[PDB]
């Protein structure tokens, strides 16, 4: 990946084949890090499990995806959102209380 980055649809198909081992590798790459590649990845992920992968990769996209899916589960989502953010928090709290 890093090699070719430094034929985009080809890579899209390769990653298509990749999609558990692939996810682990991605997690590893993100940990190591801590454009085109990023966008392609985001698109493939957008194509529970989904939300998690999206969040992990983006580490705003996470929050947006979670909110969309929400639009036990509710509590978990609101909670995850609040922790990530730490207006939005107040709204989430009010919703959970309502």
């Amino acid at each position: 990946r890093l090699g070719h980055e430094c034929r985009t649809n080809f890579l899209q198909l390769l990653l298509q084949e990749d999609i558990d081992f692939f996810s682990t590798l991605l997690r590893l790459c993100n940990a190591h890090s801590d454009k085109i590649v990023d966008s392609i990845l985001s698109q493939n992920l957008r194509s529970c499990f989904k939300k998690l992968y999206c969040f992990r990769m983006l580490n705003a996209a996470a929050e947006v995806l979670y909110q969309y899916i929400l639009m036990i589960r509710k509590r978990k989502c609101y909670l995850m959102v609040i922790n990530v953010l730490s207006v939005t928090l107040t709204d989430l709290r009010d919703e959970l209380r309502g």
């Binding site: 890090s33 454009k35 990023d38 983006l58 580490n59 705003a60 996209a61």
Partner: protein, 36 residues
Amino acid sequence: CCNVMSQEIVSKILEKNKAKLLELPLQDLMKCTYKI
């Protein structure tokens, strides 16, 4: 204001696609980190 800032950042990124560029540069935080 934050939205406008993000838009400006996106526009700058589009324009880029050395010293002057560095001068111009000087979730949003995550993006900045990825850029660096």
